[PDB]
Amino acid sequence: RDPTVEFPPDLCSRVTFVNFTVTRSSLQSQCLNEVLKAERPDVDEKRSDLLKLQGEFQLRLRQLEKSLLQALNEVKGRILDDDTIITTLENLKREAAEVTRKVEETDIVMQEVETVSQQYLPLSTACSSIYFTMESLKQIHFLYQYSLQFFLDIYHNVLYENPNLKGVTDHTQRLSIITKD
Amino acid sequence: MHLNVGLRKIKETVDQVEELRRVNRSTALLKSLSAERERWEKTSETFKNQMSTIAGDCLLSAAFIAYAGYFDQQMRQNLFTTWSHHLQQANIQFRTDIARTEYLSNADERLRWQASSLPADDLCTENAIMLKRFNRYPLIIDPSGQATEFIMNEYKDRKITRTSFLDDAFRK
């Protein structure tokens, strides 16, 4: 639990380290992802589709490739015209064009999803500063001891269960309200 | 090996078409199969391309897994950048578009980690990847405490147990 403890060299040799301490960039990105998934659920599904164009659309492309491969591996009807693999070729071309257009859509992500990230970028930096002000708050008094789970509880109670967001649907107004809350 | 077996399979289909021709229907079949082989060879071109670049990606990934386990995000990025710059200097082909968080992790494992209450930060993703694949038993440094919850959620099915050094029942 102690992040500032010092270990003898033998311990550092026998085990590998997996650092989990939260930094300014770490909390910034964590809260950016939190607001990305919580806010703009349709655009959150758009970012999910960004993930899908790599994990499913590319997966569908490769699986249709191998399905075509196995279908033409049958080599049924010797001599006879059984090379009807052509429809699978058309489907393969459609899938490849879909994946290339999804790469172009990720180029649009360098325009549109990056916009969704940068609009919440001030929020992430601000809340990271909030948490590290809370951490640095422990100096002025021994009683001002706040954990990260507490700050995440405020973050969730602001994003979720917020009475000020029930009647607001526009992204910019929701962002202003969410920062104020 | 699968791709090469299919590559010669295409020549077997060409032989079948040649036997057929020895005629416009067979000609259309031949030309569309030629387009099929065009697809084959472009796929094999990019596919040998990742064959050429597989070594550098593995080198960088291994150096990142073994080292960089204590440093923060900024210093991990700095070490990765220096390593990549040196590999570029030595004319070693390493693919750059891939994220180190994506090469070493699979979609199913990432989804299980998300169900295991893992904070979506890429640094936490690197930590999870390192916890999955290791040679020395990891030492988790988590002042936040999220990592312990993630470990318990991930290894609940294996009935992972909590115990502390101060506890006398540790040895048992």
Side-chain angles (χ1 to χ4, degrees), chain A residues 1 15-17 19-20 25-26 29 33 65 69 86, chain B residues 9 32 39 69-70 74 120-121 127 136 139 141-143:
Chain A
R1 301 319 309 289
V15 299
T16 179
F17 295 150
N19 189 3
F20 266 91
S25 61
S26 172
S29 74
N33 287 354
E65 175 67 27
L69 296 176
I86 304 301
Chain B
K9 155 199 178 183
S32 185
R39 185 269 300 162
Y70 192 109
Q74 291 69 351
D121 184 6
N127 290 318
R136 289 166 286 147
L139 178 59
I141 312 181
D142 46 350

mmCIF file with all atom_site columns, all heavy atoms in Angstrom, chain A residues 1 15-17 19-20 25-26 29 33 65 69 86, chain B residues 9 32 39 69-70 74 120-121 127 136 139 141-143:
data_model
loop_
_atom_site.group_PDB
_atom_site.id
_atom_site.type_symbol
_atom_site.label_atom_id
_atom_site.label_alt_id
_atom_site.label_comp_id
_atom_site.label_asym_id
_atom_site.label_entity_id
_atom_site.label_seq_id
_atom_site.pdbx_PDB_ins_code
_atom_site.Cartn_x
_atom_site.Cartn_y
_atom_site.Cartn_z
_atom_site.occupancy
_atom_site.B_iso_or_equiv
_atom_site.pdbx_formal_charge
_atom_site.auth_seq_id
_atom_site.auth_comp_id
_atom_site.auth_asym_id
_atom_site.auth_atom_id
_atom_site.pdbx_PDB_model_num
ATOM 1   N N   . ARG A 1 1   ? 0.819   -1.206  0.000   1.00 0.00 ? 1   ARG A N   1
ATOM 2   C CA  . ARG A 1 1   ? 0.000   0.000   0.000   1.00 0.00 ? 1   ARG A CA  1
ATOM 3   C C   . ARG A 1 1   ? 0.855   1.260   0.000   1.00 0.00 ? 1   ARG A C   1
ATOM 4   O O   . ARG A 1 1   ? 0.464   2.270   -0.593  1.00 0.00 ? 1   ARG A O   1
ATOM 5   C CB  . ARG A 1 1   ? -0.949  0.003   1.201   1.00 0.00 ? 1   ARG A CB  1
ATOM 6   C CG  . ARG A 1 1   ? -1.902  -1.185  1.261   1.00 0.00 ? 1   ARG A CG  1
ATOM 7   C CD  . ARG A 1 1   ? -2.476  -1.541  -0.110  1.00 0.00 ? 1   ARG A CD  1
ATOM 8   N NE  . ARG A 1 1   ? -3.053  -0.393  -0.803  1.00 0.00 ? 1   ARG A NE  1
ATOM 9   C CZ  . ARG A 1 1   ? -4.180  0.213   -0.454  1.00 0.00 ? 1   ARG A CZ  1
ATOM 10  N NH1 . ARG A 1 1   ? -4.898  -0.202  0.577   1.00 0.00 ? 1   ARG A NH1 1
ATOM 11  N NH2 . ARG A 1 1   ? -4.599  1.258   -1.160  1.00 0.00 ? 1   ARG A NH2 1
ATOM 12  N N   . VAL A 1 15  ? 11.855  -10.087 -7.810  1.00 0.00 ? 15  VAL A N   1
ATOM 13  C CA  . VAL A 1 15  ? 10.488  -9.861  -8.262  1.00 0.00 ? 15  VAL A CA  1
ATOM 14  C C   . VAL A 1 15  ? 10.472  -8.740  -9.289  1.00 0.00 ? 15  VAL A C   1
ATOM 15  O O   . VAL A 1 15  ? 11.350  -7.871  -9.311  1.00 0.00 ? 15  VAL A O   1
ATOM 16  C CB  . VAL A 1 15  ? 9.532   -9.527  -7.097  1.00 0.00 ? 15  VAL A CB  1
ATOM 17  C CG1 . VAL A 1 15  ? 9.471   -10.674 -6.109  1.00 0.00 ? 15  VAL A CG1 1
ATOM 18  C CG2 . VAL A 1 15  ? 9.942   -8.236  -6.414  1.00 0.00 ? 15  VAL A CG2 1
ATOM 19  N N   . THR A 1 16  ? 9.461   -8.772  -10.150 1.00 0.00 ? 16  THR A N   1
ATOM 20  C CA  . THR A 1 16  ? 9.194   -7.677  -11.067 1.00 0.00 ? 16  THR A CA  1
ATOM 21  C C   . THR A 1 16  ? 8.163   -6.738  -10.456 1.00 0.00 ? 16  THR A C   1
ATOM 22  O O   . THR A 1 16  ? 7.344   -7.139  -9.624  1.00 0.00 ? 16  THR A O   1
ATOM 23  C CB  . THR A 1 16  ? 8.695   -8.194  -12.418 1.00 0.00 ? 16  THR A CB  1
ATOM 24  O OG1 . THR A 1 16  ? 8.426   -7.086  -13.285 1.00 0.00 ? 16  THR A OG1 1
ATOM 25  C CG2 . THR A 1 16  ? 7.426   -9.010  -12.243 1.00 0.00 ? 16  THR A CG2 1
ATOM 26  N N   . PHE A 1 17  ? 8.213   -5.480  -10.871 1.00 0.00 ? 17  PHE A N   1
ATOM 27  C CA  . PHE A 1 17  ? 7.339   -4.454  -10.326 1.00 0.00 ? 17  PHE A CA  1
ATOM 28  C C   . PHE A 1 17  ? 6.211   -4.142  -11.298 1.00 0.00 ? 17  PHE A C   1
ATOM 29  O O   . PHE A 1 17  ? 6.399   -4.129  -12.516 1.00 0.00 ? 17  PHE A O   1
ATOM 30  C CB  . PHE A 1 17  ? 8.123   -3.178  -10.021 1.00 0.00 ? 17  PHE A CB  1
ATOM 31  C CG  . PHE A 1 17  ? 9.155   -3.346  -8.948  1.00 0.00 ? 17  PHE A CG  1
ATOM 32  C CD1 . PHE A 1 17  ? 10.311  -2.589  -8.960  1.00 0.00 ? 17  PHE A CD1 1
ATOM 33  C CD2 . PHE A 1 17  ? 8.969   -4.260  -7.928  1.00 0.00 ? 17  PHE A CD2 1
ATOM 34  C CE1 . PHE A 1 17  ? 11.262  -2.740  -7.973  1.00 0.00 ? 17  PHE A CE1 1
ATOM 35  C CE2 . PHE A 1 17  ? 9.919   -4.416  -6.941  1.00 0.00 ? 17  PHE A CE2 1
ATOM 36  C CZ  . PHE A 1 17  ? 11.067  -3.655  -6.963  1.00 0.00 ? 17  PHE A CZ  1
ATOM 37  N N   . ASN A 1 19  ? 3.829   -0.992  -11.207 1.00 0.00 ? 19  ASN A N   1
ATOM 38  C CA  . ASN A 1 19  ? 3.466   0.237   -10.517 1.00 0.00 ? 19  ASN A CA  1
ATOM 39  C C   . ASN A 1 19  ? 2.019   0.609   -10.810 1.00 0.00 ? 19  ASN A C   1
ATOM 40  O O   . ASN A 1 19  ? 1.576   0.583   -11.961 1.00 0.00 ? 19  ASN A O   1
ATOM 41  C CB  . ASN A 1 19  ? 4.404   1.367   -10.942 1.00 0.00 ? 19  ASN A CB  1
ATOM 42  C CG  . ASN A 1 19  ? 4.221   2.617   -10.110 1.00 0.00 ? 19  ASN A CG  1
ATOM 43  O OD1 . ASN A 1 19  ? 3.428   2.640   -9.170  1.00 0.00 ? 19  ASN A OD1 1
ATOM 44  N ND2 . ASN A 1 19  ? 4.962   3.666   -10.447 1.00 0.00 ? 19  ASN A ND2 1
ATOM 45  N N   . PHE A 1 20  ? 1.283   0.954   -9.754  1.00 0.00 ? 20  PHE A N   1
ATOM 46  C CA  . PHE A 1 20  ? -0.116  1.330   -9.879  1.00 0.00 ? 20  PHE A CA  1
ATOM 47  C C   . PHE A 1 20  ? -0.427  2.711   -9.323  1.00 0.00 ? 20  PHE A C   1
ATOM 48  O O   . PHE A 1 20  ? -1.605  3.081   -9.271  1.00 0.00 ? 20  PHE A O   1
ATOM 49  C CB  . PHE A 1 20  ? -1.013  0.300   -9.177  1.00 0.00 ? 20  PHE A CB  1
ATOM 50  C CG  . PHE A 1 20  ? -1.533  -0.773  -10.084 1.00 0.00 ? 20  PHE A CG  1
ATOM 51  C CD1 . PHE A 1 20  ? -0.829  -1.950  -10.260 1.00 0.00 ? 20  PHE A CD1 1
ATOM 52  C CD2 . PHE A 1 20  ? -2.734  -0.610  -10.752 1.00 0.00 ? 20  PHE A CD2 1
ATOM 53  C CE1 . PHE A 1 20  ? -1.310  -2.941  -11.089 1.00 0.00 ? 20  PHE A CE1 1
ATOM 54  C CE2 . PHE A 1 20  ? -3.219  -1.597  -11.582 1.00 0.00 ? 20  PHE A CE2 1
ATOM 55  C CZ  . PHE A 1 20  ? -2.507  -2.764  -11.750 1.00 0.00 ? 20  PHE A CZ  1
ATOM 56  N N   . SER A 1 25  ? -1.150  12.534  -15.381 1.00 0.00 ? 25  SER A N   1
ATOM 57  C CA  . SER A 1 25  ? -1.564  11.986  -16.668 1.00 0.00 ? 25  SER A CA  1
ATOM 58  C C   . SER A 1 25  ? -2.449  10.761  -16.478 1.00 0.00 ? 25  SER A C   1
ATOM 59  O O   . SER A 1 25  ? -3.417  10.558  -17.220 1.00 0.00 ? 25  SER A O   1
ATOM 60  C CB  . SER A 1 25  ? -0.337  11.637  -17.510 1.00 0.00 ? 25  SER A CB  1
ATOM 61  O OG  . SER A 1 25  ? 0.458   10.655  -16.870 1.00 0.00 ? 25  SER A OG  1
ATOM 62  N N   . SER A 1 26  ? -2.125  9.926   -15.488 1.00 0.00 ? 26  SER A N   1
ATOM 63  C CA  . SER A 1 26  ? -2.904  8.715   -15.256 1.00 0.00 ? 26  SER A CA  1
ATOM 64  C C   . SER A 1 26  ? -4.342  9.051   -14.884 1.00 0.00 ? 26  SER A C   1
ATOM 65  O O   . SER A 1 26  ? -5.289  8.534   -15.488 1.00 0.00 ? 26  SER A O   1
ATOM 66  C CB  . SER A 1 26  ? -2.247  7.872   -14.162 1.00 0.00 ? 26  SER A CB  1
ATOM 67  O OG  . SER A 1 26  ? -3.074  6.783   -13.792 1.00 0.00 ? 26  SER A OG  1
ATOM 68  N N   . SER A 1 29  ? -6.229  10.659  -17.914 1.00 0.00 ? 29  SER A N   1
ATOM 69  C CA  . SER A 1 29  ? -6.742  9.698   -18.884 1.00 0.00 ? 29  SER A CA  1
ATOM 70  C C   . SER A 1 29  ? -7.866  8.854   -18.297 1.00 0.00 ? 29  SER A C   1
ATOM 71  O O   . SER A 1 29  ? -8.842  8.542   -18.990 1.00 0.00 ? 29  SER A O   1
ATOM 72  C CB  . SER A 1 29  ? -5.608  8.806   -19.385 1.00 0.00 ? 29  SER A CB  1
ATOM 73  O OG  . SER A 1 29  ? -5.239  7.861   -18.400 1.00 0.00 ? 29  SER A OG  1
ATOM 74  N N   . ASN A 1 33  ? -11.598 8.766   -19.890 1.00 0.00 ? 33  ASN A N   1
ATOM 75  C CA  . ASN A 1 33  ? -12.323 7.565   -20.288 1.00 0.00 ? 33  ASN A CA  1
ATOM 76  C C   . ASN A 1 33  ? -13.640 7.440   -19.533 1.00 0.00 ? 33  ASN A C   1
ATOM 77  O O   . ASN A 1 33  ? -14.654 7.017   -20.104 1.00 0.00 ? 33  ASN A O   1
ATOM 78  C CB  . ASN A 1 33  ? -11.458 6.327   -20.062 1.00 0.00 ? 33  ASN A CB  1
ATOM 79  C CG  . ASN A 1 33  ? -10.332 6.213   -21.067 1.00 0.00 ? 33  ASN A CG  1
ATOM 80  O OD1 . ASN A 1 33  ? -10.250 6.995   -22.013 1.00 0.00 ? 33  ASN A OD1 1
ATOM 81  N ND2 . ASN A 1 33  ? -9.458  5.233   -20.869 1.00 0.00 ? 33  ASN A ND2 1
ATOM 82  N N   . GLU A 1 65  ? -12.279 -14.472 -44.973 1.00 0.00 ? 65  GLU A N   1
ATOM 83  C CA  . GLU A 1 65  ? -11.130 -14.940 -45.740 1.00 0.00 ? 65  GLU A CA  1
ATOM 84  C C   . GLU A 1 65  ? -10.914 -16.433 -45.542 1.00 0.00 ? 65  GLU A C   1
ATOM 85  O O   . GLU A 1 65  ? -10.867 -17.196 -46.511 1.00 0.00 ? 65  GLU A O   1
ATOM 86  C CB  . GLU A 1 65  ? -9.879  -14.160 -45.329 1.00 0.00 ? 65  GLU A CB  1
ATOM 87  C CG  . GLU A 1 65  ? -8.580  -14.639 -45.970 1.00 0.00 ? 65  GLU A CG  1
ATOM 88  C CD  . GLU A 1 65  ? -8.526  -14.402 -47.464 1.00 0.00 ? 65  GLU A CD  1
ATOM 89  O OE1 . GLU A 1 65  ? -9.197  -13.467 -47.941 1.00 0.00 ? 65  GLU A OE1 1
ATOM 90  O OE2 . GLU A 1 65  ? -7.807  -15.148 -48.161 1.00 0.00 ? 65  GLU A OE2 1
ATOM 91  N N   . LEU A 1 69  ? -11.326 -19.688 -47.884 1.00 0.00 ? 69  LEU A N   1
ATOM 92  C CA  . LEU A 1 69  ? -10.182 -20.572 -48.065 1.00 0.00 ? 69  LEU A CA  1
ATOM 93  C C   . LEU A 1 69  ? -10.593 -22.026 -47.898 1.00 0.00 ? 69  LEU A C   1
ATOM 94  O O   . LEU A 1 69  ? -10.226 -22.885 -48.707 1.00 0.00 ? 69  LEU A O   1
ATOM 95  C CB  . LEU A 1 69  ? -9.084  -20.222 -47.059 1.00 0.00 ? 69  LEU A CB  1
ATOM 96  C CG  . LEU A 1 69  ? -8.442  -18.841 -47.182 1.00 0.00 ? 69  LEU A CG  1
ATOM 97  C CD1 . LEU A 1 69  ? -7.442  -18.571 -46.062 1.00 0.00 ? 69  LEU A CD1 1
ATOM 98  C CD2 . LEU A 1 69  ? -7.826  -18.663 -48.528 1.00 0.00 ? 69  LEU A CD2 1
ATOM 99  N N   . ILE A 1 86  ? -16.729 -17.274 -56.168 1.00 0.00 ? 86  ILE A N   1
ATOM 100 C CA  . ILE A 1 86  ? -16.715 -15.897 -56.647 1.00 0.00 ? 86  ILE A CA  1
ATOM 101 C C   . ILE A 1 86  ? -17.579 -15.001 -55.770 1.00 0.00 ? 86  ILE A C   1
ATOM 102 O O   . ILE A 1 86  ? -17.224 -13.843 -55.510 1.00 0.00 ? 86  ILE A O   1
ATOM 103 C CB  . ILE A 1 86  ? -17.172 -15.864 -58.115 1.00 0.00 ? 86  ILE A CB  1
ATOM 104 C CG1 . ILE A 1 86  ? -16.277 -16.790 -58.939 1.00 0.00 ? 86  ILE A CG1 1
ATOM 105 C CG2 . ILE A 1 86  ? -17.140 -14.448 -58.660 1.00 0.00 ? 86  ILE A CG2 1
ATOM 106 C CD1 . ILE A 1 86  ? -14.811 -16.434 -58.889 1.00 0.00 ? 86  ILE A CD1 1
ATOM 107 N N   . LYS B 2 9   ? -2.509  -24.308 -53.622 1.00 0.00 ? 9   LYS B N   1
ATOM 108 C CA  . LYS B 2 9   ? -3.883  -24.671 -53.951 1.00 0.00 ? 9   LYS B CA  1
ATOM 109 C C   . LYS B 2 9   ? -4.424  -23.830 -55.103 1.00 0.00 ? 9   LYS B C   1
ATOM 110 O O   . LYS B 2 9   ? -5.178  -24.327 -55.950 1.00 0.00 ? 9   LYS B O   1
ATOM 111 C CB  . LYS B 2 9   ? -4.740  -24.502 -52.699 1.00 0.00 ? 9   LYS B CB  1
ATOM 112 C CG  . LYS B 2 9   ? -6.210  -24.265 -52.919 1.00 0.00 ? 9   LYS B CG  1
ATOM 113 C CD  . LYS B 2 9   ? -6.784  -23.678 -51.647 1.00 0.00 ? 9   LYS B CD  1
ATOM 114 C CE  . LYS B 2 9   ? -8.245  -23.349 -51.779 1.00 0.00 ? 9   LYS B CE  1
ATOM 115 N NZ  . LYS B 2 9   ? -8.784  -22.710 -50.548 1.00 0.00 ? 9   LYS B NZ  1
ATOM 116 N N   . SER B 2 32  ? -11.476 -14.444 -63.197 1.00 0.00 ? 32  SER B N   1
ATOM 117 C CA  . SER B 2 32  ? -11.872 -14.121 -61.835 1.00 0.00 ? 32  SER B CA  1
ATOM 118 C C   . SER B 2 32  ? -10.972 -14.830 -60.828 1.00 0.00 ? 32  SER B C   1
ATOM 119 O O   . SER B 2 32  ? -10.673 -14.285 -59.760 1.00 0.00 ? 32  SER B O   1
ATOM 120 C CB  . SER B 2 32  ? -13.338 -14.466 -61.608 1.00 0.00 ? 32  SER B CB  1
ATOM 121 O OG  . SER B 2 32  ? -13.733 -14.034 -60.324 1.00 0.00 ? 32  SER B OG  1
ATOM 122 N N   . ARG B 2 39  ? -5.630  -10.891 -55.134 1.00 0.00 ? 39  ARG B N   1
ATOM 123 C CA  . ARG B 2 39  ? -5.916  -10.717 -53.713 1.00 0.00 ? 39  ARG B CA  1
ATOM 124 C C   . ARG B 2 39  ? -4.952  -11.536 -52.865 1.00 0.00 ? 39  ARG B C   1
ATOM 125 O O   . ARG B 2 39  ? -4.439  -11.053 -51.846 1.00 0.00 ? 39  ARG B O   1
ATOM 126 C CB  . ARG B 2 39  ? -7.365  -11.114 -53.425 1.00 0.00 ? 39  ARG B CB  1
ATOM 127 C CG  . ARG B 2 39  ? -7.838  -10.870 -51.996 1.00 0.00 ? 39  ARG B CG  1
ATOM 128 C CD  . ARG B 2 39  ? -7.612  -12.092 -51.114 1.00 0.00 ? 39  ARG B CD  1
ATOM 129 N NE  . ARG B 2 39  ? -8.324  -13.262 -51.613 1.00 0.00 ? 39  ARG B NE  1
ATOM 130 C CZ  . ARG B 2 39  ? -8.052  -14.511 -51.261 1.00 0.00 ? 39  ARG B CZ  1
ATOM 131 N NH1 . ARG B 2 39  ? -7.083  -14.794 -50.406 1.00 0.00 ? 39  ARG B NH1 1
ATOM 132 N NH2 . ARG B 2 39  ? -8.768  -15.503 -51.783 1.00 0.00 ? 39  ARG B NH2 1
ATOM 133 N N   . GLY B 2 69  ? 8.582   -1.427  -15.194 1.00 0.00 ? 69  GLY B N   1
ATOM 134 C CA  . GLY B 2 69  ? 7.533   -1.858  -14.293 1.00 0.00 ? 69  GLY B CA  1
ATOM 135 C C   . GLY B 2 69  ? 7.327   -0.990  -13.079 1.00 0.00 ? 69  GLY B C   1
ATOM 136 O O   . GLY B 2 69  ? 6.316   -1.140  -12.386 1.00 0.00 ? 69  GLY B O   1
ATOM 137 N N   . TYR B 2 70  ? 8.261   -0.083  -12.808 1.00 0.00 ? 70  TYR B N   1
ATOM 138 C CA  . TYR B 2 70  ? 8.166   0.826   -11.681 1.00 0.00 ? 70  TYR B CA  1
ATOM 139 C C   . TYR B 2 70  ? 7.934   2.265   -12.106 1.00 0.00 ? 70  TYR B C   1
ATOM 140 O O   . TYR B 2 70  ? 7.301   3.019   -11.358 1.00 0.00 ? 70  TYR B O   1
ATOM 141 C CB  . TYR B 2 70  ? 9.446   0.729   -10.828 1.00 0.00 ? 70  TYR B CB  1
ATOM 142 C CG  . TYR B 2 70  ? 9.404   1.388   -9.463  1.00 0.00 ? 70  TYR B CG  1
ATOM 143 C CD1 . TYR B 2 70  ? 9.375   0.616   -8.311  1.00 0.00 ? 70  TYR B CD1 1
ATOM 144 C CD2 . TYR B 2 70  ? 9.392   2.769   -9.322  1.00 0.00 ? 70  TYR B CD2 1
ATOM 145 C CE1 . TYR B 2 70  ? 9.337   1.197   -7.062  1.00 0.00 ? 70  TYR B CE1 1
ATOM 146 C CE2 . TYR B 2 70  ? 9.354   3.360   -8.076  1.00 0.00 ? 70  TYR B CE2 1
ATOM 147 C CZ  . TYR B 2 70  ? 9.327   2.569   -6.948  1.00 0.00 ? 70  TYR B CZ  1
ATOM 148 O OH  . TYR B 2 70  ? 9.290   3.151   -5.703  1.00 0.00 ? 70  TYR B OH  1
ATOM 149 N N   . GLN B 2 74  ? 4.988   8.787   -18.088 1.00 0.00 ? 74  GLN B N   1
ATOM 150 C CA  . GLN B 2 74  ? 5.908   9.629   -18.845 1.00 0.00 ? 74  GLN B CA  1
ATOM 151 C C   . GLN B 2 74  ? 7.230   8.917   -19.092 1.00 0.00 ? 74  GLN B C   1
ATOM 152 O O   . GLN B 2 74  ? 7.755   8.933   -20.212 1.00 0.00 ? 74  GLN B O   1
ATOM 153 C CB  . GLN B 2 74  ? 6.147   10.950  -18.111 1.00 0.00 ? 74  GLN B CB  1
ATOM 154 C CG  . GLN B 2 74  ? 4.952   11.904  -18.051 1.00 0.00 ? 74  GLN B CG  1
ATOM 155 C CD  . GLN B 2 74  ? 3.814   11.416  -17.167 1.00 0.00 ? 74  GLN B CD  1
ATOM 156 O OE1 . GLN B 2 74  ? 3.806   10.276  -16.704 1.00 0.00 ? 74  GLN B OE1 1
ATOM 157 N NE2 . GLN B 2 74  ? 2.845   12.291  -16.925 1.00 0.00 ? 74  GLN B NE2 1
ATOM 158 N N   . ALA B 2 120 ? -9.799  2.103   -16.751 1.00 0.00 ? 120 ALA B N   1
ATOM 159 C CA  . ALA B 2 120 ? -9.557  2.035   -18.189 1.00 0.00 ? 120 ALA B CA  1
ATOM 160 C C   . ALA B 2 120 ? -8.302  2.774   -18.638 1.00 0.00 ? 120 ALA B C   1
ATOM 161 O O   . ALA B 2 120 ? -8.079  2.886   -19.847 1.00 0.00 ? 120 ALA B O   1
ATOM 162 C CB  . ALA B 2 120 ? -10.767 2.580   -18.946 1.00 0.00 ? 120 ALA B CB  1
ATOM 163 N N   . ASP B 2 121 ? -7.493  3.288   -17.712 1.00 0.00 ? 121 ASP B N   1
ATOM 164 C CA  . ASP B 2 121 ? -6.257  3.958   -18.088 1.00 0.00 ? 121 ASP B CA  1
ATOM 165 C C   . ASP B 2 121 ? -5.323  2.988   -18.802 1.00 0.00 ? 121 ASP B C   1
ATOM 166 O O   . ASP B 2 121 ? -5.245  1.806   -18.457 1.00 0.00 ? 121 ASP B O   1
ATOM 167 C CB  . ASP B 2 121 ? -5.572  4.534   -16.847 1.00 0.00 ? 121 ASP B CB  1
ATOM 168 C CG  . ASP B 2 121 ? -4.320  5.328   -17.179 1.00 0.00 ? 121 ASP B CG  1
ATOM 169 O OD1 . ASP B 2 121 ? -4.027  5.532   -18.376 1.00 0.00 ? 121 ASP B OD1 1
ATOM 170 O OD2 . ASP B 2 121 ? -3.622  5.751   -16.234 1.00 0.00 ? 121 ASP B OD2 1
ATOM 171 N N   . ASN B 2 127 ? -0.152  -2.538  -16.898 1.00 0.00 ? 127 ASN B N   1
ATOM 172 C CA  . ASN B 2 127 ? 0.047   -3.283  -15.661 1.00 0.00 ? 127 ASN B CA  1
ATOM 173 C C   . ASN B 2 127 ? -0.670  -4.625  -15.700 1.00 0.00 ? 127 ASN B C   1
ATOM 174 O O   . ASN B 2 127 ? -0.130  -5.640  -15.251 1.00 0.00 ? 127 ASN B O   1
ATOM 175 C CB  . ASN B 2 127 ? -0.432  -2.459  -14.469 1.00 0.00 ? 127 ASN B CB  1
ATOM 176 C CG  . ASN B 2 127 ? 0.456   -1.270  -14.193 1.00 0.00 ? 127 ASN B CG  1
ATOM 177 O OD1 . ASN B 2 127 ? 1.680   -1.365  -14.255 1.00 0.00 ? 127 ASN B OD1 1
ATOM 178 N ND2 . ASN B 2 127 ? -0.158  -0.139  -13.875 1.00 0.00 ? 127 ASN B ND2 1
ATOM 179 N N   . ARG B 2 136 ? 9.017   -13.466 -13.040 1.00 0.00 ? 136 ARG B N   1
ATOM 180 C CA  . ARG B 2 136 ? 9.117   -13.332 -11.595 1.00 0.00 ? 136 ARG B CA  1
ATOM 181 C C   . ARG B 2 136 ? 7.763   -12.932 -11.029 1.00 0.00 ? 136 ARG B C   1
ATOM 182 O O   . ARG B 2 136 ? 6.997   -12.214 -11.677 1.00 0.00 ? 136 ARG B O   1
ATOM 183 C CB  . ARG B 2 136 ? 10.170  -12.295 -11.200 1.00 0.00 ? 136 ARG B CB  1
ATOM 184 C CG  . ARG B 2 136 ? 11.599  -12.725 -11.458 1.00 0.00 ? 136 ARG B CG  1
ATOM 185 C CD  . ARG B 2 136 ? 12.550  -11.543 -11.364 1.00 0.00 ? 136 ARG B CD  1
ATOM 186 N NE  . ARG B 2 136 ? 12.437  -10.658 -12.518 1.00 0.00 ? 136 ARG B NE  1
ATOM 187 C CZ  . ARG B 2 136 ? 12.614  -9.345  -12.477 1.00 0.00 ? 136 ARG B CZ  1
ATOM 188 N NH1 . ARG B 2 136 ? 12.924  -8.725  -11.350 1.00 0.00 ? 136 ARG B NH1 1
ATOM 189 N NH2 . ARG B 2 136 ? 12.478  -8.636  -13.593 1.00 0.00 ? 136 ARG B NH2 1
ATOM 190 N N   . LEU B 2 139 ? 5.348   -7.708  -7.862  1.00 0.00 ? 139 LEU B N   1
ATOM 191 C CA  . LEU B 2 139 ? 5.157   -6.924  -6.644  1.00 0.00 ? 139 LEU B CA  1
ATOM 192 C C   . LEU B 2 139 ? 4.280   -5.731  -7.009  1.00 0.00 ? 139 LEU B C   1
ATOM 193 O O   . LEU B 2 139 ? 4.713   -4.831  -7.735  1.00 0.00 ? 139 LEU B O   1
ATOM 194 C CB  . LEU B 2 139 ? 6.491   -6.480  -6.052  1.00 0.00 ? 139 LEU B CB  1
ATOM 195 C CG  . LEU B 2 139 ? 6.407   -5.601  -4.803  1.00 0.00 ? 139 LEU B CG  1
ATOM 196 C CD1 . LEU B 2 139 ? 5.664   -6.307  -3.692  1.00 0.00 ? 139 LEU B CD1 1
ATOM 197 C CD2 . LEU B 2 139 ? 7.794   -5.212  -4.336  1.00 0.00 ? 139 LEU B CD2 1
ATOM 198 N N   . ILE B 2 141 ? 2.440   -2.330  -6.534  1.00 0.00 ? 141 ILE B N   1
ATOM 199 C CA  . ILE B 2 141 ? 2.527   -1.097  -5.762  1.00 0.00 ? 141 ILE B CA  1
ATOM 200 C C   . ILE B 2 141 ? 1.297   -0.252  -6.059  1.00 0.00 ? 141 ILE B C   1
ATOM 201 O O   . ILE B 2 141 ? 1.290   0.541   -7.008  1.00 0.00 ? 141 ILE B O   1
ATOM 202 C CB  . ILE B 2 141 ? 3.821   -0.327  -6.079  1.00 0.00 ? 141 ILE B CB  1
ATOM 203 C CG1 . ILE B 2 141 ? 5.021   -1.271  -6.039  1.00 0.00 ? 141 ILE B CG1 1
ATOM 204 C CG2 . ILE B 2 141 ? 4.013   0.816   -5.099  1.00 0.00 ? 141 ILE B CG2 1
ATOM 205 C CD1 . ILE B 2 141 ? 6.337   -0.591  -6.326  1.00 0.00 ? 141 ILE B CD1 1
ATOM 206 N N   . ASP B 2 142 ? 0.254   -0.406  -5.248  1.00 0.00 ? 142 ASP B N   1
ATOM 207 C CA  . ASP B 2 142 ? -1.026  0.262   -5.483  1.00 0.00 ? 142 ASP B CA  1
ATOM 208 C C   . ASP B 2 142 ? -1.447  1.060   -4.257  1.00 0.00 ? 142 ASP B C   1
ATOM 209 O O   . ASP B 2 142 ? -2.163  0.533   -3.385  1.00 0.00 ? 142 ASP B O   1
ATOM 210 C CB  . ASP B 2 142 ? -2.105  -0.755  -5.851  1.00 0.00 ? 142 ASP B CB  1
ATOM 211 C CG  . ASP B 2 142 ? -2.105  -1.962  -4.934  1.00 0.00 ? 142 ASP B CG  1
ATOM 212 O OD1 . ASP B 2 142 ? -1.154  -2.102  -4.137  1.00 0.00 ? 142 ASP B OD1 1
ATOM 213 O OD2 . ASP B 2 142 ? -3.058  -2.765  -5.007  1.00 0.00 ? 142 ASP B OD2 1
ATOM 214 N N   . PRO B 2 143 ? -1.033  2.322   -4.136  1.00 0.00 ? 143 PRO B N   1
ATOM 215 C CA  . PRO B 2 143 ? -1.571  3.153   -3.049  1.00 0.00 ? 143 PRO B CA  1
ATOM 216 C C   . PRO B 2 143 ? -3.064  3.386   -3.172  1.00 0.00 ? 143 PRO B C   1
ATOM 217 O O   . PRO B 2 143 ? -3.735  3.593   -2.152  1.00 0.00 ? 143 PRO B O   1
ATOM 218 C CB  . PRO B 2 143 ? -0.777  4.457   -3.180  1.00 0.00 ? 143 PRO B CB  1
ATOM 219 C CG  . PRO B 2 143 ? -0.395  4.519   -4.619  1.00 0.00 ? 143 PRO B CG  1
ATOM 220 C CD  . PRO B 2 143 ? -0.206  3.096   -5.077  1.00 0.00 ? 143 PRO B CD  1
#
